[PDB]
């Protein structure tokens, strides 16, 4: 993507979707990464490991997310943080979808894990990535136990067909 | 046996003191209210206990105004 996107994929998306106005072409708006360390109060260090790993993987300082309300079933309440997230836009999001589609997909153990369905219905697509290994980063040594990842893609697509067209133009496996 | 009720507080004497069409001088209290039943308009001041008072000599007037339908009290000079 980047210049190649702006130059060629916009044009073929217009041609494929047959939309009169140029502005109607779907555009990738942002990608959000979210990971929650449940019951962080118990050990009080998994959170530090998680923010370190997130800072390593993404070129942005993650923001620690506090809980809202108190739930008796769990040990969580409004006091201590329970998760962290980051939102990526601009050149950052472009190089991000880029190196992902470049390096991460050939190595995934099970291809086609991403599905044509699972779309939120408004044109936004959510994926869950297992383990904090499975990216280019530090090896298993010198890092804390494994952790999950959630990625959400929000575009300008007005619906699911437009969204799937945009992902196919980008090169998403399915 | 015995009842477990039987308590109440002393009276507070809340209510309106000056009605519409009355003449007031600066400082006169116009309304005593626990909440903001009435809102101050022109030449009317609000105290810490939500009491409304006159800040100028004139005549009292009541009205309904605003989007919320708030009742207002003002003084016309």
């Amino acid at each position: 993507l980047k210049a190649r996107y702006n130059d060629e994929l916009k044009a073929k998306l217009q041609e494929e979707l047959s939309i009169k106005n140029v502005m109607e072409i779907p555009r990738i708006t942002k990608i959000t990464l979210n990971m929650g360390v449940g019951a962080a109060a118990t050990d009080k260090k998994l959170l530090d490991g998680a923010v370190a790993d997130m800072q390593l993987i993404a070129g942005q300082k993650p923001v620690v997310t506090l809980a809202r309300k108190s739930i008796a079933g769990f040990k969580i309440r409004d006091g201590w943080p329970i998760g962290c997230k980051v939102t990526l836009r601009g050149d950052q999001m472009y190089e991000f979808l880029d190196r992902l589609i470049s390096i991460a997909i050939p190595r995934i153990r099970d291809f086609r894990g991403f599905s044509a369905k699972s779309f939120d219905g408004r044109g936004n697509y959510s994926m869950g990535l297992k383990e904090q290994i499975v990216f280019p980063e530090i090896d298993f040594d010198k890092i804390d136990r494994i952790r999950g990842m959630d990625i959400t893609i929000t575009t300008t697509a007005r619906t699911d067909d437009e969204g799937r067209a945009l992902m196919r133009a980008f090169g998403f496996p399915f | 046996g015995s009842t477990k009720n039987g308590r109440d507080s002393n009276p507070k004497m809340l209510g309106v003191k000056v009605y519409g069409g009355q003449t007031v001088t600066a400082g006169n209290i116009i309304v005593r209210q626990r909440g903001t039943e009435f809102h101050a308009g022109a030449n009317v001041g609000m105290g810490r206990d939500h009491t409304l008072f006159a800040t100028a000599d004139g005549v009292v007037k009541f009205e309904v105004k605003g989007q919320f339908g708030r009742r207002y009290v003002k003084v016309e000079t």
Binding site: - | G1, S2, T3, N5
Partner: protein
Amino acid sequence: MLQPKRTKFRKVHKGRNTGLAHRGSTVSFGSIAIKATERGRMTARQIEAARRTISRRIKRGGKIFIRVFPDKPITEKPLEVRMGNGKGNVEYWVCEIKPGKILYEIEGVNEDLAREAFALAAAKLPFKTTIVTRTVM
């Protein structure tokens, strides 16, 4: 005995019963109905007894609609007790009745049998009653 499942307050004031029942004086669930003509109080046991009397004679062949609910609690002092020392204890529930209030409607039964059932039921109630039929206006 019908009784509310829950209430905000255990004990209520005596009040006064005046006026007429402009609402609830129209037949809306059946063809024939029994309607009160003088005011009073109607208790839960009386409701149940009248319902039993009507159901027995109609032989459970039609629908009986009960439009009275005993929602008003009534208290009574123990007995051998002097005046004072707080309000009495709830003992039974009643329903206030104003003239024109409908009590029981019958659906799906012959008119003569329904009238006979209402005649049997009226002997159990503490106020005068009449019989009404559905009308267009």
